[PDB]
Design a protein around this ligand. Sequence first.
Ligand SMILES: C[C@H](Nc1ncnc2[nH]cnc12)c1cc2cccc(Cl)c2nc1-c1cccc(F)c1
Length: 814
Amino acid sequence: SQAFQRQLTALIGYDVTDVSNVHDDELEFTRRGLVTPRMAEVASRDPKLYAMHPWVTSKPLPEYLWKKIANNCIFIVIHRSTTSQTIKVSPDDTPGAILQVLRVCGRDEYLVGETPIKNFQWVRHCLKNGEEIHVVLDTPPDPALDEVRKEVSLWDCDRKFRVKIRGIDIPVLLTVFVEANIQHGQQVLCQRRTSPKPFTEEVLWNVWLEFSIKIKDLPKGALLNLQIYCGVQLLYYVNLLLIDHRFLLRRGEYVLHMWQISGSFNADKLTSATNPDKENSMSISILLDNAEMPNQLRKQLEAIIATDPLNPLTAEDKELLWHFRYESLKHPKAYPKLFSSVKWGQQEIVAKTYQLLARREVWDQSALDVGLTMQLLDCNFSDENVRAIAVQKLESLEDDDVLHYLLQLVQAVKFEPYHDSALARFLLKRGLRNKRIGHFLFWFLRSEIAQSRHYQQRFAVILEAYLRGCGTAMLHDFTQQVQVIEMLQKVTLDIKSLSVSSQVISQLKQKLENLQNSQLPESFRVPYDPGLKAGALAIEKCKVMASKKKPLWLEFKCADPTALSNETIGIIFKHGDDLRQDMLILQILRIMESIWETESLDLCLLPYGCISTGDKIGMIEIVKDATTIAKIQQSTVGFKDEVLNHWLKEKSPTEEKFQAAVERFVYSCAGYCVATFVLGIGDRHNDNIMITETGNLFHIDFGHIKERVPFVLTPDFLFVMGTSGKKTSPHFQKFQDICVKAYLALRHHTNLLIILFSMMLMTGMPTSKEDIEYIRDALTVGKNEEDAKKYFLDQIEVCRDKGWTVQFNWFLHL
Ligand SMILES: C[C@H](Nc1ncnc2[nH]cnc12)c1cc2cccc(Cl)c2nc1-c1cccc(F)c1
């Protein structure tokens, strides 16, 4: 039965049994460790609701979706074979009560379980778009299809820490030296260097570097960071956990293959993986052989505790937090700063910190704050006990909320010192309790496994463990999806080599037909929208873009005869862009939408599906009935203020729907102006901005990132609102209205956005402190509501002063 592992390997894209690039058994130990959590979740998941995976939420239905309901009545069409009967229902009615199993027409999605109909996400999607709810009375799918295949005390050691640097070796290439840091978090506890030697293919020192920290004082999670400098500049780094996965001090002989720089806060610097490219890479050879507080002080403490996660703590600040430890422990918000005040290189202090962690009643009772929780999972905390109280708060997240934060919870595994962590186990568990979570976990993990040498090993092990409990059907499903993207990526990569396009449109359609009759299956799940199953290509409709990167525009029939639309499923396949950056930005746009929802604001963003599948390669969802702003301008002029406004007119049939497009545009434009300004990606050329035929503006192509402009509010955009250089219409006054409310609604979650932005830069954008601290300024940290309002409207006006000037400057450049 070893062909089951051979399968797993294929689904993963990496061989987890391979021990060709290890120097201990941490990886294998983690495989065995993950068995128990897997089975606990497997054995306790409800077979029925696992099969139907109701996508559901406990959040209230917002004001904007209440005022679309006809007096406590919502209509639901029901279909049998050629039947279409229409039942009246109240929002509070259950799938039990409305039944006089309802599956959604066209989709692999179910309205089942003890939930009111207003709390299913598919229902809310229908109310939002103005659409009506269509269902079939189907049999429940068989849970048997989901069957899972049958399976000296260290504190008595006063001697100083030392490491022997024997030397470095490189096959091919002034002078060079080795720096050896004892690190915890991004914090250097102790640092020693060698003397400089000439930089030859082999350099030997044969020297003991004796550190000032005692062996009894090395905290668990401490890394020996070995770096190589020339002159100075950093050229190579590698890490080694000083305390291993069995709580044993690391001992003996090491030859570690190192990573090279160029291609500084970057998550790759932290990895404990060695370079597997044994043949080209630099190696290093080492030997380990070993009353209560008064008023002004409270106010000073409260001011420290109130500051944003990127406000630096002085030595003075840290000393106050530590001395007033127990007062600080009463404020959940103090936690990141308090634990950044611990001297982790002193055992007796660490011990006190653990006694502090045992008194966390207020923490245990606090309401879940995701922003505060994520801060404890970032690069500044390497202690397992601190990180675990963060994961403990995650456990109360309902499934709707896991999905919102999933991409960034997977990225934050990169800040774990060990492969087996409470965070890895939380992701395993939540993924096996819910198919939608599991589907996306598969692809987020696979995305990293296929292109990150620094972390593929760790992520591979987590994914295997997921796959061994997701059950036979999901396995079949995953296999099918992977086969299709490998076929389609091949075709994408081949067409590209044949570089508008004449004999290429011939070649493309030949190859598609060739795949259609031969390799491509009956049907497959769309990776970015797991409820849709695509069938056979519409070869007629597929094309390649007049473009440097030559992406494929592909269109598919729907495999599901119960579907009530004729619409096709459109997927773009592209090589050339780093789509990891796009995934992170689009997910942050979804988080921004859910923030706005909490304050009854809809800004109609359009965060389309995107999945990185490999090195500079992946897929993008085709938004139907949409074109670019640049193209709309080419059409009428060959820049003019009015062309967008009457493009919108000629697509709207009735005056009823035109005005609807204009308002939808005012909202859309508001959302993207605020969102892009906060993320510092607002200055775009307008062939990276799109609009639907129904007025929904949306930015695209985020994985790319002179005079400046904060965002895009051009005269064509302004003209749709009714403003001509220096005027102010009703619709423009409303745009300002919405921008201001949207901006202030994001500032109420300042800490959350700062941590997500920080993490984003570090794990998906090869970064300095200067880069990270943009969003502080963008969110006008420290300022009041009225002063922030003035800031943003000044930005709105900075766009007005420039009209077309950056657009044209882009025109010349590009
Ligand atoms: C720029 C435009 N982008 C998107 N179009 C539709 N949905 C999307 N989702 C994300 N990006 C797009 C686009 C991408 C293409 C990719 C491959 C092949 C072709 Cl022919 C592409 N064409 C466009 C495009 C360009 C102008 C107008 C238009 F409707 C589409």
